[model samples]
Target: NMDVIGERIKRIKEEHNSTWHYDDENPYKTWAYHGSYEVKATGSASSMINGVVKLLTKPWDVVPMVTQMAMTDTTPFGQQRVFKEKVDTRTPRPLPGTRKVMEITAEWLWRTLGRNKRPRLCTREEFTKKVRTNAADSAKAAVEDEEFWKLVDRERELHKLGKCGSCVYNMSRAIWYMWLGVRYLEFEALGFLNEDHWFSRENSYSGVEGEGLHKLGYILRDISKIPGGAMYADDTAGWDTRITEDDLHNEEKIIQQMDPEHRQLANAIFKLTYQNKVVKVQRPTPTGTVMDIISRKDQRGSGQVGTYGLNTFTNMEAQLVRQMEGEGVLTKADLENPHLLEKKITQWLETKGVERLKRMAISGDDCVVKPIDDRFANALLALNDMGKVRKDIPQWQPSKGWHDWQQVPFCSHHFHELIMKDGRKLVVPCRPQDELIGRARISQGAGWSLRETACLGKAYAQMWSLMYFHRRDLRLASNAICSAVPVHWVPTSRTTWSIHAHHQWMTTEDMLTVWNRVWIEENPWMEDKTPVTTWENVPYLGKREDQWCGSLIGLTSRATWAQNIPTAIQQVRSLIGNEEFLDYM
Candidate 1:
């Protein structure tokens, strides 16, 4: 019976691990090109010259540009009328007929010297080399030509005509070619095409409309065949349903219309109950005594119950024992000795009851959750005020006001460490702007009511009211306090194979790791240890340390007084003058 129970438990864990999406799957595996509607040049000198000539002949040929501009307007009012035309001209176009003259001359020269056919779908290496070579030569020509610089400077003064038109035109052509080369390389690298693939009539799309369109349709159809692709393209693809502050306010009012006690009872019931069945299994022991055991009925179909009946305590104990053995506190031989095992278990039990031990066993030393109090509330208020004054301070700007500061993301909370006047430490929960924005969007989608959510905002206000009486003491204690802005490098994708950097709020321990690094080095004799470190041995920090090393500027002091202390002191001395400076005389 015990063997069967153990086997069931193993099966549950295996199933859970197999189905879990967060651990193994890359969320950003599918990439799609979102077509742009903006007016853009084809990046060919001939195309631009032809366009210029056509525009000159038919000045009222602005209908296409105007229509595109009107179509791309996302605003509700459609009031934006400003539009800029893109032009790519490599050489001088003094007159419209000049291009015609050059075209005819080029044709005559081609016939006179035996026409040479251009290479078709050249090698990747050759294409890259040609594009780079052309760009380099163009750059060199621009730099060496005194007339080019004069034209660029003259264009800079005429902003209405366009600033640095020639330079922009050249740069645009270079970038366009480079972009094409990059896409080509990416396609090859991703196995979308083979090295020998050529743009021949067999492989290339035909000029026929519906026939060529089918190829694109087939490609999209294949992409949509992927489970994630279908979900992203079909289900989640649309403009967001409009949700407003007024809607939330109305929802809150409707929720409040219910009896407060009834709402509380419903919340309590939800907190106590879970959707699973309990079963009692009775079996006869070897001595013929009946042993009763209560077990949760394994519901395989249920999505919520993941890896049920896996003993976390047993897992922690095994992990602790292994760690101890690895650290030389225990040996393989000691495990065979019953007496040594018993002694170790006793020691573990004694140590495990401590708060830190429990924290470590569950969520590690970095996890510190503390209840909100008057002092912490005041600290948050101060932090918010500092953010308002500086505008650059890395702190949460509440969606509404200070009332929304405690309304953090669902199922997650952010914490910052605070030291009290009596030297007591508190890990105060704080919201991050990035998290708040994410939560707001999620909440909009989930249709969560404001009143149904946790009432931390009310508690925050209550604490502020109590702290008002002891505002003087709070201010005095806060003078020594400093704020560490949290910043993190979030990868654009889960796999993070490509180079893309995104800034988001760093975890509390991540912020502290850098904050205490200099202190740890400067005060080596001090016995105190930080919960985390910025050292390379730490896996999370080591993964993308190079990108963040210079970018983590927020992990430092931003106080105005702290920034220019020497200058401030000098200014004070100068204000006092030599006569009043020496008071002892």
Candidate 2:
């Protein structure tokens, strides 16, 4: 039967233009419509059978059909319908093959067989035990590491040399004082400390240079005591003595025998002095020594005491030694050997002052102090008085409370009476807090702290004076004074303009008139009603933020703006002809 079927199938494949292959077991398996051949054949057979039955039922029609078939020598099967359907083998549909089929079967089997099993949660006791075990393992590993021990040994050595927490605190304070020294020297070198400078006057709210110098001298004296060199020359010598195991254990220990406060002081002093030696070794330089900085050069190019010179070098040295002697940082014995003291002082100054000057060079308007007009100076004097009065109030004491608060009548609730150039008086509140309340608020209440109040009063005083002096043009005045105040203090809410307006404290309309005029003129591009509120909104006659270095001590805005004058003149000259420029000038 199989042989007969195969032969029949082969015969059918070879007949006509059939595309059937005898080698293929199931050709329709990869087709989009599998079993379509059998379905088509079955439908055709059924329709043929039904047509035959209908012909049988109508004998007259059947007899005619049979006569016609006999006459023609033909049958109903004479014509055949050939199916033209062809699979697009040019773009063949690939079989799934072995790997994909296996993967799909495996996934199906896994999902059917596998069950959901949750992981067991640890108990509290088990969690704690696990954490402790991990901690112990980490500790053991760290202890076994050689690098860890090396670091610990280094730290121990530092601790033995008085590099403890308290020692660090003292050293930090010393470094702060040293920074102040550098700032002081910078001011002196730039000529801001000159007598004729507006802020350098004796009674000015800004401190006098002489007092600053004296304070600097004392700071240097206190910090310059080296451990072995001059530790026992004075009472202040114990402030920085080095620590040792013998000092800690022995009965007659040098530094440890003192009270806790004095012992800590000694350790701090020793640490800073030793650290100074370390810094010197790190950065060695050839020139710009203290001797060169202080000494005068003669015409012959030799360091000498020139005729008619102030001899400030010798004077400063004598003053320093005397101050040290009085303060017990230096004793009578240290003074007897004056040359030794001089050498020590020179070394300290060279290391602290001249050594630091190598990297620092003056640039921009930060260094220069511009002279103030005489009228402005008088106005500044009046402002200075108000600040002094504000600063004179005792600091709030927790124990004394209001008792300490009430000592000064104007401690927290008074207005300053500023005398203007035209003899008119303007009464301004001492602080923003004073404007808000009549009595001194408790230390914990909402207001400026004591120190903040003092600084604010000084800044306010400066603003008031500058505004009065340039009352005809307040934009110029504000640009001049705003840099003197901190950048944080110039916002709309905290500004002097807003504060004065809030309290209706304007004595005359001059300030208001000038403010409106400057605002309107400078901001013509903006809306006419655009109000001047913040410092950034207040326009300048020229470029306001030109100085990249920011405000310098004792420097006014006019001076800063004056730096652009030459360039401005040159630009104008380039625009106009030289002859016309000269004629206009």
Candidate 3:
């Protein structure tokens, strides 16, 4: 049986080869087309501005095309055909090199700073020298500088201007303020995203359990006998890269905490055990076009596109519509008349289209479908509450139900049925109650009961643990309530009858736009547009100015500086309230 397992593994891949094309002629084709943005020039002014404008105005337009090679279907041919597509790789990105990495860290900083035309006071080099040499006292000196203070002030404006909409100049500008701001410069001193190149690797002398000598022997045997490092530079890259001895010990602690099934799964997963190593080496490498495919029903059922119809609404939109109705935006007659309701809904979409959508889709306005407001959300919910739909949906409730329910409003809902290579319908049932409570938890976090938060907290804790132990990602499980597809990867490998939810990828611009708005909208300080200096003078009731970190007092999670190992540990604890996370961190 073991022999056959190896033979079947080899044969299975050979059988799959003809159906899934792979050739060296186009070595580049192995990488998918949907890498998002494809930014050619990073620091160019027009480049960054063009990217931002693309994000705000055409937020929904830039969907990453699912390549043919991405699909995971092993036996694409034969009588009993089975189709499989990977959800997406669920690897945890080695906690971002935000301190070193430009693209992401720069965006976060610019977003919080709220975009400006002027450059920041000091270069990255000058600020680092000053901070490293003087410590906290330098932070005070930098703030006291009058010219530096004006640059900080200019960075706070959000009134929106020109072809570049909201958060326009904000990103590059935020990069500047964060570079100078005392809050961020300190992370370098703490040795984060700095010269040393620390990561979350678990391979080290202390990672293995039992006697130190045993673990030391394992590390030694695997390590190169040659001086300095490995035989090749790339080989040494793996050998030299390491985590702290403390980190390795903590990883063991977390692994020990697990129950039998999970502990075994985690341990087998954590180590490159013989069986896993063999299987990994044998598994088909992605060397051609990648495909991610799924059925429309499964796609609709998944909350990635919200609900299935064009009428589905956003939380903010729903609340607004409720208020408008209370003020008689729609009367009893308007409620009863489908035409009247539709007209009113169209008007509302047009209004928001002007305000948020146009700004979001500056360059690609045509592709950016304005998100539906709450009136539609309520109408759809009300329709669902109403009795069964006629086979031709509209005929079922001629008075008010959504007509032509097949046409999807959200850009994310764009899809044909799940057409396997051999051609068969893919059907996955939808769950209404799951998304209902899921959406409620987010928009109504203030109203969630203690038990609800606790239960949700524990659920999130398991997700956090599994991600670390097994080295997979957890999309905060907030997305879980919305879809059966938990990991971004659709579950195809384990089954004949598989379910997958095809999703659209968000560009950096799209991600930043949403993040920037969320940050500004949520932060109390942003509402008043307060400066770091102003806050310093504002009373903290008791403590002297020197005691607290200067900029943290004013920042929310939106700021790039908020994400350090220490603060990240606290954030994890707050979300899941599990001590095990500390071990992994």
Candidate 4:
């Protein structure tokens, strides 16, 4: 009965007290050695090397030199949030690797991180003691020689001048460890702190190589001086690589520009700020209702259908967004009212679609779609990968169907399509649906002709025409205004957990952008709100086909921006299409 199932989810939100990177169920793939592929962080700040600890975990190998330009070290980042390669000194590589990255901003960090205790890990005594304990020759003290302490003066002198990579790593690590003890000093003072707590299940990925959250946080909380740090990069490389420093500098600049293009971040980001827009939730669409489920007809007094807008979503959105954040996926603060429109727009148009259209414009033909049996659900049903769902059951319908929905492997290598109508050799020379009054420009190349676009068959052409036609009506109905409305959906499995709906508007873009949002019910972000069954986390059971469907859908929609179908389809596609998880959604 509940749309977002907000009531049942109240107790599941543990992020308020739980550590950001803890994996309650999975020990192996989390904490230090999780080998993550996704990343979200702000670009390197021009203000370099806040301290030695900060320098240790800078997402790339620590350069021997520390200065205004230290933040520019060129490491091959596989993603925006998750950094890759500790240090491949053998070869100079791309910064922020060629692999795509997802980015989150400082604004996102300030918001999600709750007020935390600031620890005092920097003491002249402790700093000097650390230097003495890890001196290249441990017991060898050159304190009297002055040369030893000089190297410990700052990160640059130590890494570049002294040519010490591990020193750079240790100076950073030692301080961070003390910072953990200091920040949670109240706990330590009260006999509640453990120096190694950062490696515990509550703090980081326990049972991991001593390289996970403990190190990252220690590096950040103490050395970096960033109260709320986002470790979306990697910096564990010693200068053992054989690349010349100069060559590495040039590539670093190139990668500094390769940060992830800004995105609205979450589907709810737009809805929360401006007017009302549409957002998917767990509740069944109207299609789920029998003839008269709520008896809205009686309430309307006219025995007709009832209509609700963004106001229908007030409470539901709030609860869900908070819950998902609690579980470590989307951040509630970022969605409040932040996004990069120009950047997102420029990036989306950089694809082949615009190129193809330009050709069609010059050649005088319609952008056609070939008709085909395009059953989206079938893809999920046909996958054969171990994680792909052969049946639909996960926790329910015991032993009745596929375990996860993602297991639906694709049967046909390609989506079959047809451009011509059955037996109709050619389409009639008809006026175009694209051309309406002053809505479109008309030219020989712009106008439709008798030629058929092999890419699009008659059914597909009709479908495209139909979809566009529908858009035109909607535009005119709303006074020629149409904004991207993000709609998030919950896989059927989560239906029992939370279900909600919404309508939102974009507040920016002055021209076609959204503005003036409204909400009647509380709706919150929900996908990834609950931890999923993973290979290591679940000894008894793993993810089923149905369980992976929502994630798969999100990955595809992200692959491209169609400006037509919902963005979800593209992100979902991006994920499933990744050969690794290739299957139906």
Candidate 5:
């Protein structure tokens, strides 16, 4: 269904020549946050006072600084978009505290003595007047003594001048908030302009504190490490307990060994994302035929010889079709697209799996799972089973001994594992991290890891390997090519969201260096594309259209690159830059 929706939007764009972000040498032409952590802006262009403060500032207290950065101050950001035309502060500001203050103040004002709801007692307008009035009174008092107000001005300048440790710390946090806003604005624009919304839910999670989507990959990674290989084990049946007994012990040791604050942040983040109350929705049924049911059952080892049935889904799909038609979101032409329906139903089932994962999370609130169990595998195998017998066909009726339905939860952080035949023992000299990490290289000494610095240290190896095969079969770029492809998955501790047209080419060391430098640019440039070369707005350079699927497994796998060890190391060393950052790595 979403595929169909996307197609419809795409067609409309094509018709209108609506592609906005394409520009001179900037293929990704559109309003969007930088895909990777690439910082396009090379130098700081700011008020002299701000630069001076940064030089003088120390970072003794990071917490309060982080808070201030996020809640109240406007910070510099990189972007080329329509929003900048309307406001001076296109970047994020430290007004999150101000926002919260406004919210709380409004709530208090709305509270009534005798009734539940009341009118506003005060608002921005009222508050502004009082503040200005108070300021005028203070100014009158200061008029008599120049030194009194001079001290206040001096103190203000000190904070901005970076004399305070908090001042320097505050900017780092502020940048993150700015980034958060950048992501929100882009996502919001996409939603309003097109019917093809890409979110799991319609409403985007715009202004919540801290990283949300960036942490998604991190959260998934952490869930796997929490003594269970995956979250979906209950649905497909239990996992074969991939980690060794010692592995589990070591993992627990890792958890216990972590700083208490680190552990708390981890748990709090988990709760913040997954433990929230689920939105109420009418449950839909399955849409598969008997053959489809059988195929799923076989995949998960979930069915029996007789007790044959398939229902629960057809009517639900039928219901979905009706709703879409009534809403004018779909047409007869859309119904003809078979894959669209398949993915639609797949998402529905996947949601059920997410629900089960959350339930298991509650059971494991201590953040550890019970010993691995595979006996309950295929717990959700009957998800596609038929409910009632068909009367229009060879009629059937079940007597006694129906296949028993079971409550199953299946969440997994692993799959296609390299393990022994017994399904009980993992292959020796192996760790789950091997496959997960794929081609990624980490620094043994001060040398940095590709994943730690490069654009997401990433990709899907299957996709990359496939690219090699295709390029080998039909030469692309050049014949001397050692089969160019995209970067694959890399598992490391740090979490950041990066997608890039900052592609890496394996032919020579120079190209690799170019790719690595922009791999994790902190502030991707506004005017230029991925390896942001410019820091400020480039209105003269025409806009680039937002092609969000550049990194997705879509028509064009352009937002990716190829890598080799020699090139990788070279890339890392240079991006780390100079003696200090290089050594810090």
Candidate 6:
């Protein structure tokens, strides 16, 4: 059967003639409009942001409509119109072919990053010469020169100024950023955006330079707190490009007038919206659209907009009123009055409308929001307590694991070499402390006792024998956690998710947004490479060493094992007896 199946593996698309449509002229019609439709739904799955919404099968299809090509017996004909879904959960991303890609094999990645390698910095003279030689093709030394740095900074500002409310500018800017950031790479990893050509890829990636440059505009905007930065206005003529000194002063006054708590949020929104057209993605819609479809029970719910004709309270609506009371923004009387929850839901819907559209523009994958926050931290931490994680470095609490995007992939691979060691052998890159925690907590809690957790922690580490310098059997499990989804993907989720309380309470997107604010935008030093310099310049005490080639530091799983007893003791001692390490450099 295997051979026969293989022999018959010829190109076969299901149908060339009639698509899921009523007629030949406009196959894009939804089943709602035409009963002569072919299928119920055309299921699609996407991972990358641009992989779905923007990268259309038919780009010129003007009236973009989502056709429910298929449906279940609940509603046999097409009904649900959720054209886009996102698996936006905080769980570690699955490896391309495995469930554990972003989880259990973490220790491997632990070693690859921050193993103590420092990037080499050349003198001004050396920098100038290198730029001159490498950029010979461009007929300029801009990539390396001091002046080049200035130009890049100015260019960044110019691009930010371009984001306009106009659809044309937004489309161009969005396309530009994605193309530059993802087109040519091993994967859409951190450093891949700036890297013009991959050394290991040979010349196959040479043509990617121009495209990469264009895509950067949008990627920079989406990945950051900048709004107007998301899409530029066509001020190519430079007339609308100016943001004068007086404008900043007026904006400052408006910000001061805003309530202090919302000031940070408001200021952030202001920066993004200035001179930008995208006011709100989904403009507010009335509650009427979904009102008629409400279930009978919901109709009776106290949260209803219209009166039930008799005064009564519902348990669900009572809870909503309780939250408003705690906020001191409203009282129980507010809910009893009328139309509170309905209004609330409508506002929430409107706020998320265009935003979701923007997100769907990239990925067409069906995804749910991941609850990666402190409320779940206890469950996540128990895995470490049980020793499922190698216990070398901190567990995968988003913020704790992020490192330089510039030195990633290669850097992560090498750092894993030094940190995690097995019995007389260096095992695992570092150790997947997070997934171990997640798995241990799932299925009604971890089965291992304290002693067993300790013992198995040692065994699980042995699975990661793959090494850059040592022997590498390259087991599927090891590759899944380390190579599939590196830790740095969602960097700042560390403290946000560690509370366990927050994880259970907050939405995954809310948690991720908080993570983004601290890790990506505010941290002045985040994206900086020259790792050794960062490590050295920072106030720390160590007999630190790195390879001559790159910002490489090496450690092993010895720390994880030591942390079980001796490691814990040493950590306490180091803090008490040698508090000197905390001194700022």
Model 6 vs. true fold: TM = 0.17
Evaluated against the true structure, the overall lDDT of model 1 is: 0.23
Write candidate 5's Cα lDDT for 73-157 as tens digits.
1222222221233211211221222222222222221121112221111122332343354334433333334454344334334
Per-residue error (Å), model 2, residue 99 = 99
Per-structure clash totals for the candidates: 0, 3, 23, 114, 64, 81
The better candidate by TM-score, 3 or 5, is 5
Of models 3 and 6, which has the larger lDDT? 3
Off by over 4 Å in 5: 1-359, 362-381, 386-431, 439-578, 581-585
- Model 3 residue 77 lDDT? 24
**In model 2, where is the ten-residue run with the lowest total lDDT?**
290-299
Can you tell me which runs of candidate 3 are displaced by over 4 Å? 1-294, 298-324, 331-338, 341-343, 346-585
What ranges in model 6 sit over 4 Å off? Answer: 1-83, 87-585
State each model's CA lDDT, in order. 0.23, 0.24, 0.23, 0.20, 0.22, 0.22
TM-score for each predicted model, relative to the true structure = 0.19, 0.18, 0.17, 0.17, 0.19, 0.17
Write model 3 residue lDDT over 149-196, tens digit each, in one string: 454333322111111011101113332343354232222121221121
RMSD of 3: 30.3
lDDT of 4 by residue, 360-468 (tens): 1000010111101112112221111101122333412212111121121111101111122121111111112222211111111222221211111111222212222
What's model 1's lDDT at 35?
12
Q: What's the true lDDT of residue 433 in model 5?
A: 24
Candidate 1 displacement at residue 372 in angstroms: 31
For all predictions, the C-alpha RMSD in Å is 36.9, 44.7, 30.3, 32.5, 26.5, 26.3
